[PDB]
Write a protein that binds this ligand. Sequence first.
Ligand SMILES: O=C(O)CCC(=O)C(=O)O
Ligand SMILES: [Fe+3]
Length: 270
Amino acid sequence: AKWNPAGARRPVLDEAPVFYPTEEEFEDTLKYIESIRPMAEPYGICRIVPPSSWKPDKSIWEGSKFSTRVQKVDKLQNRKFGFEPGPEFTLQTFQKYADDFSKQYFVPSVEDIEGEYWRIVEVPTEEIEVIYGADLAQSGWNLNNLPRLLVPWVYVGMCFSSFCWHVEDHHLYSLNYMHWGAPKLWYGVPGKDAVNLESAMRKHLPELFEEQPDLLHNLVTQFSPSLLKSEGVHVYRCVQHEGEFVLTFPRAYHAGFNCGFNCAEAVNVA
Ligand SMILES: O=C(O)CCC(=O)C(=O)O
Ligand SMILES: [Fe+3]
């Protein structure tokens, strides 16, 4: 359908911490991580901007194919059993599709998009669907090297495509790098608040748990940070741009969505 600027329901949240490692600190991923852990841990999420040094093909772009899942954004939180399959794309074709979706729906700022996104999930006025592809030097920052010192997965997102609330498989971290494209909005909740979040969800969305007692492992439910906040849950926003990492901590709840066509890669680790 279309944007509705005056119906924006943008969450009012504290920012998660940002880290600007120096070239030295940056030569050992695992170590730098341990080093920021004490200050970042209490937020459950943090963002990491690589130093100037750090730098990260036509026929992959044009040729390599992947499949997608369909998401009904208006039904991620409010509904009376998830993401059906969608068409096959290439990056090239996905982008043309993604860009057109946005151009028609709306150039908005991130807060414009964020305000609309939560409007769509908290108070939708129209069905709205969206597609995404998921699970497709020398240093651990090149995520293919980290299992060494579990494998890296790739994610193609578009405006409004979502990763719904969850905690990583075990007590695992996850490290996420944004290769190219539009910003990814993240919401993070500290490990010590896992209880408050699940109980907040059970409280407000009782019906669902009834009919899917295992919601929390299904990755199929978005839940407003404003509602979390009302219940005393600490939620920290962060905005990941192209070329940046987002670090997720053990037992830390996290969710978000994309502000447009983008491509990102993530791995778990302890
Ligand atoms: O962005 C996604 O679709 C995946 C989210 C996730 O599970 C993670 O990497 O922490
Ligand atoms: Fe995750």
